[PDB]
């Protein structure tokens, strides 16, 4: 259960550049550091992660990572593992305005594009190249939102009813009557994404006007089949690529409201804790076979706590691979949000400070 | 002013509710006719926790008796305290459930559930601040079981910040009273584990053992067992009513006991017991009370807590007692029995004291433990489940009512998952590979 | 003039307030109802001392305190008890469910909706005062109402009221004896708020008082009342300087000046020398030297620490009763020569002396015996670091496996905040080890 954690910093936006803002993030090698504007004289906080990505300006001859570099680091290997008949999971995290949309999607200039467009383009190009008389391929897409431990369909324009989760004894957890649509190239894996994003639940709080309120899961089911020169033709190769947009954590102080606005956040925080523990187990499990060969006991990772793990069971365990990317805001104003994101990233394969 | 609502589904739940209400009415000094005749004003200091006022200065209890067999309602209404409950809360149907979970969850319960939800919503709106719910049912059922689980799910969906308790009776290992018991038990436990914060474990065999060996009774009946369960429930709910040197709210118990959200099954107990003739020789002190508290025979779940390594424990005390005895005794019990406790909690015992003792006793104690040994119950049921599922012993009577096969396998998988989570914190060290 | 407006938060605060106000009312002759026959008998005086009470036209006397809590069962006992006519009806009890030992609930899910009214009532009380030399906040670590509400109230008060002193009397969980399984979480969370706002916070441990009551007083089976009585006597000894005449009086600012060497080490201990029962009251001279020597006895300390394993930064003594300065100087000289009580190199004076002519009063019933002398010893000790370390270890044993985190997380607290508070505690420990090292 390979785990990779990457922390990226976005450049200044229009609002930050309009004011006389300052940068409070420094990064070198494989280490990140922040300084508190409130009390500059105490000490700089430091953390270590598996990947660090500085992105402020173009030339930046020391420690600059274009989108191609991070794609080659994470997405290319993830897709390569996907093709050989295995499950794949990619997580995005970051507070509102941290720039997770910049990381995953990017701009449409065809020179700086995110992980999703690059991955989809490489997938469709490889499928188009390899499709000979024997091989054949199929791809299916679905999109859903998890919200107060209830699952809703974003693609279907039907009534926003709560679907029922089931456990097929062979195929594992799944959702009943979840909309599924066929796709053929990149143009489609988007219009679907835009339509699903338009339907997501969202409200306004004291922190931001358009702060999200629910987790989103984007499932790509990839099926292969090989037509041999005989009657015995079987697929035997079904892969799942999961892309999870995780809503940000929040304090009850920042969410200065009572009632539903509190409740959602509380439940959100619960998921944002338990998933951490699960991945905190996998990484440790991953270290077992790797170095000390600890196999004794399934060490059954707790898996049913909430719904978000109990639906991604097949994708996050077994022999799958997991990447997680956390966006940071370099503005001095958002010190607490950045510190919270960095501390959350510090979990899930903690690494000492070198 | 904290306030808790009570529901009782099935024959066992209704009988336990009647005995519980007769016990609480005696403790608070309520007459059968509904009038008040007490000895001190302190009883009425917090009467709102279970009762409601009336125009004639009467006190009407808060209960919703639900059942599908009119015979139990007729028996209860003609009992010693039959008239105490207001008539409108007696909601019921006919044709029974027939000891079938499918009839009591999908076919017949769908009609009475609407009326029960209307009544419980009306009751909940009337309280000043709802704290939680209580539900009583026997798992090996089909009337109480299915409707109880349905009400649990509906109430959890509607009110999601109120500690929903449940005092339930599960199948015994050897003393079997019905043939389709494991199916109902497994389905109901699957529907129960995800929709409750604190559920207690009562076994008929344990109550019979307590009645025989300890109380030295000759011919026990259902009344004695209902008494024990009522005593335990009152004790559990004690701290909300009367003051004390240190109190234990229900949410305090919920926050302190359960370590992780899943693991919420509790093993209860009550002390002391003199067996009607040893009271003259037995000395009532805190060390003797706690010594009988942790003894295995007192326990009401039929799971010996010697293979368990207690995860957590709470002890609600009732009486005027110096706390030094309580604290030193708890520390001594921890240190002397270190092998029967977990190491990654530094100290794992909570205490609470109420100054007002029970009428007719100088001091009493109520035990609410949480130990891994409860797996020995669940696993047993699981074994019997497969023993009747491999060949489909009586599976057709459930598919007749529109229940698919997948729902049984899902419940069994959840059962095995619960057993395995219990089991991880059961070996007395890791240091392994 | 010389007011000491006090706040009680939590059940520990309420019980300690009961004991404290019983002691004060018995000291000043205030009847439980509020009337004062003593001044009327005298025919003009100042027995309605402003340090703890306020006087109205009709001869009644109202105390200056609040009893904020979330459990009505704790305050209704006082509301309908023997003292029902003394307090103002604004005892400010919340009619809502308890916080259930959860720091987050006591901070920003149910601790809110009350804090505005509490601050308003505190403002109304303080408006009547031309003094207001210091706040007294009693609480107990353990979460729920106490720690969370104390943290919020201190955070608001430090902003609103500026530089006025704020003494805290905090009950601390014992190493071996505990009454909650989420106590270490709550204490490690509450340090992050008590460190940066409380100017000088004391500490008292239950197990220490249990041992002291077992040994000295021959009380085999003590209860909460005796512990509250001892804490009441300690606070009375501290605050006696502001009310009665004395040869060498010490104000609250003197405590805040002498006992704190640096801002981050303002965590002293306390004790009480003549804690002697009636039967043993005789057969002992109880000279000034003997009680002063008994103050530093390790077995009588009010928190389970070993002062032999540390060094004394500063010490302040407050004597009550017939104690002349010559004997005090002789006792100080005799104490300073022993090498068991090691002193730091950078504080060669290391003592503050104080005398009050009012002898201690005896609460009826109770346990203490009448003594014509007494002394309250406060000292800053490095050994208190040990008292943290054990608690810290408990936290480090429980936070790793993620136990009881779901309840806290589901009430508005982010997971990361824990670590921040933990780091701060470590910093405090390091600071103590930085100060006790000998100079080059
Ligand atoms: C005469 C006398 O005092 O003897 C005791 C007695 O011997 C013991 C054994 C009693 C007795 O209980 C039993 O024999 C018993 C039978 C079946 C199941 C459980 C118990 C007693 O029957 C039960 C009875 O309890 C009460 O009266 C309480 O109020 C009890 N309520 C009732 O059950 C009740 C009894 C009579 C009339 C109305 C109600 C209660 C206690 C706590 C909380 C709620 C309710 C008491 C004191 C005794 C007898 C009579 C022997 C005990 O019961 C309780 C809960 O008090 C059993 O464990 C206690 C310990 C007592 O020492
Ligand atoms: N010394 C002393 N300690 C007390 C007293 N009352 C309560 N405590 C302490 O309070 C702790 C319980 O936690 P608290 O937060 O104070 O309880 P509470 O004030 O009722 O608030 P909740 O915990 O939310 O119920 C115990 O560990 C006790 O040590 C008292 O009267 N005297
Ligand atoms: N503890 C207890 N259990 C009971 C009592 N009466 C019946 N039971 C249990 O209840 C189970 C029967 O379930 P039941 O409620 O009758 O189902 P129903 O007939 O469909 O309502 C049996 O396994 C009995 O052991 C009682 O008085 N006390
Ligand atoms: Mg409380």
- CATH code, domain with C211: 3.40.50.1440
The angle subtended at Cα B427 by Cα B425 and Cα B433, nearest 5°, is 100
Q: Domain-by-domain residue ranges, chain B? A: 2-259, 260-373, 374-431
Exposed / middle / buried, residue A327 (Cβ in 10 Å: 0-12, 13-18, 19+)? buried
Closest ligand by atom to C206 CA:
2
Helix and strand element counts for chain B (H, E): 14, 12
CB-facing half-sphere around the CA of A178: CA atoms within 13 A: 22
Q: Has domain B2-259 been given CATH number 3.40.50.1440?
A: yes
Residue C153 shares a structural domain with residue C242: yes
- Choosing from B69, B169, B171, B397 the residue with most ligand 3 atoms within 8 A of its CB, the one to mutate for a pocket test is B169
**How close C64 gets to chain B, by Cα (Å)?**
25
Structural domain tally of chain C? Answer: 3
Sequence-ordered strand ranges (E) for C197-335: 200-205, 271-272, 312-321
Residues of A labelled catalytic: 97, 99-102, 245, 248
Exposed / middle / buried, residue A157 (Cβ in 10 Å: 0-12, 13-18, 19+)? exposed
Scored b (16 or more CB within 10 A) or e, C59-74 reads ebbebbbbbbbbbbbb
Residue C301 shares a structural domain with residue C398: no
Is the shortest distance between the CB of B369 and ligand 3 below 6 Å? Answer: no
* Nearest CB partner across the interface for B262, out of A169, A295, A305: A305
Tokens of B319: 């009486």
Is the shortest distance between the CB of B17 and ligand 3 below 6 Å? Answer: no
Helix and strand element counts for chain A (H, E): 10, 16
Residue C318 shares a structural domain with residue C344: yes
Distance CA B208, CA B279 (A): 21
Question: Are the beta carbons of A273 and C406 separated by less than 8 Å?
Answer: yes
Residues of chain B neighbouring C11 (CB-CB closer than 8 A): 246-247
Residue C294 shares a structural domain with residue C332: yes
- Give the β-pairing of B2-9 and B64-67: parallel
Alpha carbon of A108 to those of A188, B244, C131, C368, C397: distances in Å? 15, 68, 68, 83, 50
Residues of chain A neighbouring C104 (CB-CB closer than 8 A): 252
Ligand 1 centroid–CA B276 distance in Å is 10
- Position of tokens 């069994």? B412
Q: Under a CB-based contact definition with an 8 Å cutoff, are residues B6 and B19 in contact?
A: no
Residues of chain B neighbouring C146 (CB-CB closer than 8 A): none
Residue C338 shares a structural domain with residue C218: no
The coordinates were experimentally obtained by cryo-EM
CATH number at residue C422: 1.10.287.600
Count Cβ–Cβ pairs < 8 Å, chain A vs chain B: 32
Which residues in chain A are followed by a discontinuity, with C-to-N distance exceeding 2.5 angstroms?
none
Radius of gyration from C-alpha coordinates of chain B: 21
Q: Is B426 on the interface with A (CB under 8 A)?
A: no
Residues of chain B neighbouring C142 (CB-CB closer than 8 A): none
Closest ligand by atom to C183 CA:
2
Please enumerate in sequence order all residues whose Cβ is within 8 A of that of A207, keeping only pairs 6 or more positions apart, or say none. Answer: A96, A250, A254, A255
Residues of chain B neighbouring A275 (CB-CB closer than 8 A): none
Question: Are the beta carbons of C398 and B256 separated by less than 8 Å?
Answer: no
Answer yes or no: is A101 a known binding residue: yes
Distance CA A12, CA A25 (A): 12
Residue C102 shares a structural domain with residue C139: yes
Residue C179 shares a structural domain with residue C54: yes
The residue of B253, B255, B370 whose CB has the most chain C CBs within 10 angstroms, and thus the best one to mutate to test that interface, is B255
Alpha carbon of C38 to those of C27, C43, C203, C228, C236: distances in Å? 11, 9, 36, 27, 21
Helix and strand element counts for chain C (H, E): 15, 11
Domains of chain A: 2-346 (3.40.850.10)
The residue of C115, C193, C264, C410 whose CB has the most chain A CBs within 10 angstroms, and thus the best one to mutate to test that interface, is C410
Question: Are the beta carbons of C177 and B327 separated by less than 8 Å?
Answer: yes
Q: C411: which DSSP letter?
A: T
Binding-site annotation: residue ranges of B: 11-12, 97-99, 138, 141-144, 175-177, 181, 204, 222, 226
Residues belonging to chain A: 354
Please enumerate in sequence order all residues whose Cβ is within 8 A of that of A228, keeping only pairs 6 or more positions apart, or say none. Answer: A134
Exposed / middle / buried, residue C416 (Cβ in 10 Å: 0-12, 13-18, 19+)? middle
Ligand 1 atom with least separation from CA of B270: 58
Distance CA C4, CA C137 (A): 10
Tokens of C118: 């509490």
Residues belonging to chain B: 433
The separation between the first and the last C-alpha atoms of chain B, rounded to the nearest angstrom, is 53
Distance CA B174, CA B168 (A): 18
- Position of tokens 């104490």? C335
Cis? peptide before B272, omega within 30° of 0: yes
**How close B210 gets to chain C, by Cα (Å)?**
29
- Choosing from C103, C146, C152, C270 the residue with most ligand 2 atoms within 8 A of its CB, the one to mutate for a pocket test is C146
- Position of tokens 């509400």? C149
Resolution in A: 3.4
Ligand 3 atom with least separation from CA of B204: 1
Distance CA C84, CA A347 (A): 54
Residues of chain B neighbouring A302 (CB-CB closer than 8 A): 260, 262, 421
- Choosing from B65, B100, B138, B302 the residue with most ligand 3 atoms within 8 A of its CB, the one to mutate for a pocket test is B138
CB-facing half-sphere around the CA of B279: CA atoms within 13 A: 11
Ligand 1 centroid–CA B26 distance in Å is 11
Q: Is B262 on the interface with A (CB under 8 A)?
A: yes
Sequence-ordered strand ranges (E) for B171-225: 198-203
**How close C287 gets to chain B, by Cα (Å)?**
32
CB atoms within 10 A of CB B62: 23
Q: Under a CB-based contact definition with an 8 Å cutoff, are residues B152 and B192 in contact?
A: yes
Tokens of C296: 């530093």
**How close A1 gets to chain B, by Cα (Å)?**
18
Is the shortest distance between the CB of B109 and ligand 3 below 6 Å? Answer: no
Q: Is B414 on the interface with A (CB under 8 A)?
A: yes
Residue C56 shares a structural domain with residue C174: yes
Distance CA B391, CA A177 (A): 31
| Sign of the C-alpha dihedral computed for residues C55, C56, C62 and C63 taken in this order | negative
Distance CA A239, CA A219 (A): 10
Question: Are the beta carbons of B406 and A300 separated by less than 8 Å?
Answer: no
CATH class of domain segment(s) B374-431: mainly alpha
Q: Is A213 helix (H, G, I), strand (E, B) or coil?
A: coil
CATH class of domain segment(s) B260-373: alpha beta
Question: Are the beta carbons of B160 and A305 separated by less than 8 Å?
Answer: no
Strand (E) or helix (H) holding B397: helix B396-399
Distance CA B262, CA B258 (A): 8
Looking at the DSSP bridge assignments, the partners of residue A218 are A143, A243
Residue C95 shares a structural domain with residue C231: yes
Question: Are the beta carbons of B312 and C181 separated by less than 8 Å?
Answer: yes
Residue C378: which domain range?
269-383
Strand (E) or helix (H) holding C321: strand C312-321
């Amino acid at each position: 259960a390979s785990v990779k954690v990457a922390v990226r910093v976005r450049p200044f936006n229009s609002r930050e550049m309009s004011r006389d803002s300052k940068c409070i993030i420094q990064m070198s090698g494989s280490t990140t550091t922040i300084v508190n504007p409130k009390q500059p004289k105490e000490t700089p906080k430091s953390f270590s992660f598996d990947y660090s990505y500085w992105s402020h300006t173009s030339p930046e001859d020391i420690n600059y990572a274009s989108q191609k570099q991070v794609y080659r680091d994470i997405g290319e290997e993830m897709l390569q593992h996907a093709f050989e008949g295995y499950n794949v999971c990619i997580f995005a995290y970051g507070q509102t305005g941290a720039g997770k949309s910049y990381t995953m999607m990017g701009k449409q200039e065809k020179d700086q594009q995110g992980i999703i467009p690059q991955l989809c383009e490489d997938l469709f190009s490889r499928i188009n190249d390899t499709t000979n008389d024997n091989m054949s391929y199929s791809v299916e897409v679905s999109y859903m939102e998890i919200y107060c431990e209830r699952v809703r369909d974003l693609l279907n324009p039907k009534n926003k009813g709560n679907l029922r989760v089931r456990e097929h004894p062979l195929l594992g957890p799944y959702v009943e009557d979840l909309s599924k649509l066929a796709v053929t190239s990149y143009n489609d894996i988007q219009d679907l994404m835009d339509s699903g994003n338009k339907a997501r639940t969202v409200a306004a709080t004291n922190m931001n006007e358009t702060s999200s309120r629910s987790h989103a899961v984007f499932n790509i089911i990839f099926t292969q089949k090989r037509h041999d020169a005989e009657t015995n033709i079987t697929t035997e190769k079904v892969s799942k690529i999961s892309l999870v947009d995780l809503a940000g954590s929040e304090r009850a102080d920042s969410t200065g409201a009572k009632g539903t606005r509190l409740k959602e956040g509380a439940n959100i925080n619960k998921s944002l804790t338990t998933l951490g523990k699960v991945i905190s187990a996998l990484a440790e499990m991953d270290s077992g076979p790797n170095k000390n060969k600890k196999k004794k006991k399934t060490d059954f990772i707790l898996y049913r706590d909430s719904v978000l793990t109990w639906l991604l069971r097949e994708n996050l365990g077994g022999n799958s691979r997991t990447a997680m990317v956390a966006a940071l805001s370099p503005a001095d104003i958002n010190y607490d949000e950045t510190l919270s994101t960095l501390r959350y990233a510090d979990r899930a394969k903690q690494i000492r400070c070198n | 002013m904290r306030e808790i609502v009570h529901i009782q589904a099935g024959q066992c739940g209704n009988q336990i509710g009647a005995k519980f209400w007769e016990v609480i009415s005696d403790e608070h000094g309520i007459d059968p006719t509904g009038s008040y005749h007490g000895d001190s004003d302190l009883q009425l200091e917090r009467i709102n926790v279970y009762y409601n006022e009336a125009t004639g200065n009467k006190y009407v209890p808060r209960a919703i008796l639900v059942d599908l067999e009119p015979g139990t309602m007729d028996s209860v209404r003609s009992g010693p305290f039959g008239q105490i409950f207001r008539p409108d809360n007696f909601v019921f149907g006919q044709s029974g459930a027939g000891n079938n979970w499918a009839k009591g969850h999908y076919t017949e319960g769908a009609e009475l559930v609407d009326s029960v939800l209307d009544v419980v919503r009306k009751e909940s709106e009337s309280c000043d601040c709802l704290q939680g719910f209580q539900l009583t049912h026997s798992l090996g059922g089909g009337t109480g079981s299915g409707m109880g689980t349905l009400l649990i799910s509906k109430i959890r969906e509607e009110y999601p910040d109120r500690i929903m308790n449940t005092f339930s009776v599960m199948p015994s290992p050897k003393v079997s009273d019905t043939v389709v018991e494991p199916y109902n038990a497994t389905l109901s436990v699957h529907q129960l584990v995800e929709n409750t914060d604190e559920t207690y474990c009562i076994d008929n065999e344990a109550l019979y053992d307590i009645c025989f060996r300890t109380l030295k009774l000759t011919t026990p009946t259902y009344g004695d067992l209902n008494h024990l369960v009522s005593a335990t429930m009152s004790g559990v709910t004690t701290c909300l009513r009367f003051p004390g040197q240190l109190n234990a709210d229900l949410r305090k118990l919920a926050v302190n006991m359960v370590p992780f959200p899943r693991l919420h099954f509790f093993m209860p107990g009550f002390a002391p017991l003199t067996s009607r003739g040893s009271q003259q020789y037995r000395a009532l002190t805190v060390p003797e009370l706690t010594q009988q508290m942790f003894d295995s025979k007192n326990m009401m779940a039929a799971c010996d807590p010697r293979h368990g390594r207690y995860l957590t424990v709470a002890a609600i005390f009732r009486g005027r007692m110096s706390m030094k005895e309580v604290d030193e005794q708890m520390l001594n019990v921890q240190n002397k029995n270190s092998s029967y406790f977990v190491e990654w909690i530094p100290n794992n015992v909570k205490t609470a004291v109420c100054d007002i003792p029970p009428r007719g006793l100088k001091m009493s104690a109520t035990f609410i433990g949480n130990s891994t040994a409860i797996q020995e119950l669940f696993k047993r049921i699981s074994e019997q489940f497969t023993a009747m599922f491999r060949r489909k012993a009586f599976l057709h009577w459930y598919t007749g009512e529109g229940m698919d096969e997948m729902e049984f396998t899902e419940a069994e998988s959840n059962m095995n998952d619960l057993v395995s989570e219990y089991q991880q914190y059961q070996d007395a060290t890791a240091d392994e590979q | 003039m010389r007011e000491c407006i006090s706040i009680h938060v939590g059940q520990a605060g309420v019980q300690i307030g009961n004991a404290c106000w019983e002691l004060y009312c018995l000291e000043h002759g205030i009847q439980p109802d509020g009337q004062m026959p003593s001044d009327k008998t005298i025919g003009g005086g100042d027995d309605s001392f402003n340090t703890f009470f306020s006087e109205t036209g009709a001869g009644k006397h109202v105390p200056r305190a609040v009893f904020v809590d979330l459990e009505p069962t704790v305050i209704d006992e006082v509301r309908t008890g023997t003292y029902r006519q003394l307090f103002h009806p604004e005892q400010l009890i919340t009619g809502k469910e308890d916080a259930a030992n959860n720091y987050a609930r006591g901070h920003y899910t149910i601790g809110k909706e009350i804090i505005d009214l509490v601050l308003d009532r505190i403002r109304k009380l303080a408006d009547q005062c031309t003094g207001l030399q210091g706040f007294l906040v009693f609480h107990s670590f353990g979460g729920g109402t106490g720690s969370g509400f104390t943290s919020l109230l201190m955070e608001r008060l430090s902003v609103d009221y500026g530089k006025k002193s704020k003494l805290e009397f905090s009950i601390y969980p014992a190493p071996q004896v505990s009454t909650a399984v989420v106590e270490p979480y709550n204490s490690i969370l509450t340090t992050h708020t008590t460190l940066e706002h409380s100017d000088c916070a004391f500490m008292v441990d239950n197990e220490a008082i249990y041992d002291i009551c077992r040994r000295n007083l021959d009380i085999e089976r003590p209860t909460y009342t005796n512990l509250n009585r001892l804490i009441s006597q300690i606070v009375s000894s501290i605050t006696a300087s502001l009310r009665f005449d004395g040869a060498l009086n010490v104000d609250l600012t003197e405590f805040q000046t002498n006992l704190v060497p640096y801002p981050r080490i303002h965590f002293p201990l306390a004790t009480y020398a003549p804690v002697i029962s009636a039967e043993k009251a005789y057969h002992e001279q109880l000279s000034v030297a003997e009680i002063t020597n008994a103050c530093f006895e390790p077995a009588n300390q009010m928190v389970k620490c070993d002062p032999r394993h540390g060094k004394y930064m500063a010490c302040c003594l407050l004597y009550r009763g017939d104690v002349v300065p010559k004997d005090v100087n002789a006792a100080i000289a005799t104490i300073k020569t022993k090498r068991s009580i090691q002193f730091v190199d950078w504080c060669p004076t290391g003592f503050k002396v104080g005398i009050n002519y009012q002898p201690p009063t005896v609460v009826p019933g109770g346990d203490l015996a009448k003594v014509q002398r007494a002394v309250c010893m406060l000292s800053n000790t490095t050994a208190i670091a040990e008292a943290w370390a054990r608690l810290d270890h408990k936290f480090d044993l429980m936070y790793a496996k993620r136990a009881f985190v779901h309840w806290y997380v589901g009430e508005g607290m982010e997971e990361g905040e824990f670590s921040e508070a933990r780091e701060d505690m470590a910093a405090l420990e390091k600071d103590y080890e930085e100060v006790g090292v000998d100079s080059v």
